Amino acid sequence: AVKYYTLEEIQKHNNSKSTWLILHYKVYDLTKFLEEHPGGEEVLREQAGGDATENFEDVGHSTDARELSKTFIIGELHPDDR
Ligand code: HEM
């Protein structure tokens, strides 16, 4: 099932490669995706250990990309956080 994770859990996943971020409470495991992503690694890693809902939704991307994104959900905001 979804691995319920607090901001903390993501905040801990932020290293040179080790990259997690949040896109509407849902935690996206982009550590692999860095190298796949047409928008590169740097950006995602910079957003790492935080809610990048902002950056995804503000960049806007594409329906397809919005829907591709789901494949990287590992977790979601702790029921106290959420
Ligand atoms: C987790 C969801 C993500 C997925 C699956 C994803 C997917 C993609 C895809 C498919 C593109 C190509 C353009 C398009 O068709 O939309 C793209 C471009 C891009 N992405 Fe992402 N992305 C994700 C998250 C992010 C985040 C959080 C950032 C910001 C740190 C970001 C920054 C960019 C940038 C700057 C581009 C380049 C736009 C251009 O072509 O000028 N993406 N992404």
Measured over the CA atoms of residue 30, residue 76, residue 12 and residue 59, the dihedral's sign is positive
Cβ-count burial 42-51 (b if 16+ within 10 Å, e if not)? eebbebbbbb
Domain that holds residue 52: 1-82
Residues 6+ apart with CB under 8 A from 1: none
Residue of the CA atom closest to atom 10 of ligand 1: 65
Reduce the secondary structure of 11-70 to three states and give it as a string: HCCECCCCECEECCCEEECCCCHHHHCCCCCHHHHHCCCEECHHHHHHHCCCHHHHHHHH
Please classify residue 24 by burial: count the beta carbons closer than 10 Å to its beta carbon, then call 0-12 exposed, 13-18 middle and 19+ buried: exposed
Pairwise CA distance, residues 18 & 49, whole Å: 9
Q: Can you give the CATH number for the domain in which 64 is found?
A: 3.10.120.10
Ligand 1: list residues with CB < 6 Å.
Answer: 21, 23, 28, 30, 37-39, 43-44, 47, 52, 55-56, 59, 61-62, 65, 68-69, 72
Q: How was this structure determined?
A: NMR
Count of domains for the chain? 1
Tokens of 17: 């490669």
Q: How far is the CA of 39 from the centre of ligand 1 (A)?
A: 5
Q: Binding residue per annotation — 61?
A: yes
Cα distances (Å, whole numbers) of residue 58 to 5, 61, 82: 24, 8, 21
